[PDB]
Symmetry: D2
Subunit: 237 residues, 4 copies
């Protein structure tokens, strides 16, 4: 019953529910079955960067994921957010593990959104930038197994003291302030988000992924959304 728009960094192929058979990035509009995907050549244990852009002139959502010294993977999709999301939203990061597992570490996150009235041609804007997360990060709403402050990082899913990821974990971090995403079909916010992430797995099989998401302001982790549902969806429809 939540409304979700997300960019997923999907590390585990769930072909039974429409994943491609390889790690991929995807654009999810109200469904874990991505509207568009691109192959992702994941590098275990290297810091990656994700960049997400929504152009309100073209109403086009795009995402680029890359590592230093490697090609990027890119995916783009036409979507009118004014016709999918409520007027006010929260933005967040989500991750999960299932039978297989991985660290889901966020080293930094920034976000910018601008909403320009055509009434006044003046602009409301929100910008935030995390380059360090503290043990008491009061401007984040943490959900599930998410924690902050270990080495200054945000750990979205559970990691034991020895440093090993745990399976069957789900966690999210939403920015405290709601975001005004649209006022009309003619007035929709432009925004961009960037985060750096570190996904490590002991097994040859990391799972399940990280996502940047946009939700209704009161969104919470859906029941049974560990594993392939990325902490985002109550089912695989």
């Amino acid at each position: 019953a939540d409304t979700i728009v997300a960019v997923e960094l999907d590390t585990y192929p769930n072909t039974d529910i429409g994943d491609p058979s390889y790690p991929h990035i995807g654009i999810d509009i109200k469904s874990v079955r991505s509207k568009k995907t691109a192959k992702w050549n994941m590098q275990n244990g290297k810091v990656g960067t994700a960049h997400i852009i929504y152009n309100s002139v073209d109403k086009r959502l795009s995402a680029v994921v890359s590592y230093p010294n490697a090609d990027s993977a890119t995916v783009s999709y036409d979507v009118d957010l004014d016709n999918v999301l409520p007027e006010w939203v929260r933005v967040g990061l989500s991750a999960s593990t299932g039978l297989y597992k991985e660290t889901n570490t966020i080293l930094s996150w920034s976000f910018t959104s601008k909403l320009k009235s055509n009434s006044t041609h003046e602009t409301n804007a929100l910008h935030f930038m995390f380059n360090q997360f503290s043990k008491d990060q009061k401007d984040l709403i943490l959900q599930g197994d998410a924690t902050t402050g270990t080495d200054g990082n945000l750990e979205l899913t559970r990691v034991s003291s020895n440093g090993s990821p745990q399976g069957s974990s789900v966690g999210r971090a939403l920015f405290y302030a709601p975001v005004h995403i649209w006022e009309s079909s003619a007035v929709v916010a432009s925004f961009e988000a960037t985060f750096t992430f570190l996904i490590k797995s002991p097994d040859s099989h990391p799972a399940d992924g990280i996502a940047f998401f946009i939700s209704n302001i009161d969104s919470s982790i859906p029941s049974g959304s560990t594993g392939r549902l990325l902490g985002l969806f109550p089912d695989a429809n």
Copy 2:
């Protein structure tokens, strides 16, 4: 009980409790009795601009209020905010009326805070900008008589359908997200705020004024803070 740092635009001289005998701007550190003031040549019914700045290098809090084509009033005070404020705060705008009254209309409000930590030398930052306020402004916490949306403005205190301000009114607006305002592990910490305001009075004499304030995150309007205490303080100590 609340911890308050404020810049006041004090329109009504309460000489009983330390006010000079003229409209003034003042720096308030945990008391309504300002640590420093400057005379403010108030112009009834003209849009004004207030600019507030602090950086941890000067450790100097300053404010400027001005109108188009007029001399500005400036006030400064040396103060070490990490010894005054809690680490996490909320920021906001407050206003009140008493026996005498005025409109306390906010046309725009922006704020930036930056924390640059001591050895990664990276930056945590928050920036917001309101050039319009709507009737359901979800990124603002409204307290007391504050309302939004009438002509796209924020009305801190009660105004009738006439456009007529009311006495004994008090209202505040706080930005939804807490702000990490200092960290004793930061090379530089700094913030700045700007707002534009319209204060109209039918009377010979406007009252009581507008303040930008910084507070503990769970700050609420103190009992008995209408009038001269500007919705900020429980008493005049």
Copy 3:
């Protein structure tokens, strides 16, 4: 000989050389014959706003022109600018008049360009903002009849002491610093520009229009570019 990418606000239909039979906005890639146009419901004597955006992810150049309380006109074109422009460029504003005329008054101009390089993932950036122009605006290179300082504005084309625009006029303003607009070693490259403009005509018909352009750094007004060529092109090829 110059290399030009421009967004034109074309006020005068030159159907002889490919213009539609109405005022329009167009995307120009190395020719005055626009790759894409949209109809522009011009309002004589009202302040307009133009917004131009490009990012290397969409590789899509878009522009929007609008007035307060009116439908905006939008035009977009898929284009790979690293295959069109030199690596270093200057950015600027151009305008002209011909047999018919108009004022080509710029009230404000801002621009941001960002280059994020492929493996440090760091950012090189330039941002400037003009909300006032003075008589000796040293960060602008003025060409032809362009002047600054009259009522704090930039007059791209010749206006008499009357406030009366003149025919056969051409003028440009380029920002002093060259811009590193693409690097084939960048993850993301992007820019955006905004300006506000006032076009007044005594005539039935205004001419000839205003453009935001991107050029080789040593770009100058081509011989014979007054009127329909907007001070941008040597011919109508």
Copy 4:
């Protein structure tokens, strides 16, 4: 005959011309004999960061220099730039060697300046950010021995192929666009600059230093300004 305001990072004590007897940071107003200094505990071969701020409300120039995991050195000085500098300036970085020597490597440089008319309460602003310098850095004016592009860095003074600094070297880098620093005593720009630097010396005696400076737009390296004059002054008056 140039007019110079600078923040110096002075690595070599020239006590004969008023240096303190230890490495220091200083604020120089039209003279190499700093108006104010603070002791600087320099770390050979570690990347340092310099942050410079001018507060136009207080008219106070401050500078902080630090290394990761170390205390910072700070210096502040009251100076009305409207009464010292011309209305338009260039900003730059300078360095020199003399009998003794050091690498004077710049790894990054950013600058922001805002000038707000009280006529319109609107703002002109310039921001630039270098996180990488290329071999052909067209938005920098290089003077003397300064070069760019080696490992993506700006080398202000001469370094041989083996990597060893050379004595008797002087070089500067000015940003291409002039900067509007003041319009009146009531209208002066606020600005801030940051750069990271790497000073290495083979000998126990590094010399002579790096400076952030503000000059007349046509400033050039003064004759005989190698060594203790930091490429800034024609003499030691």
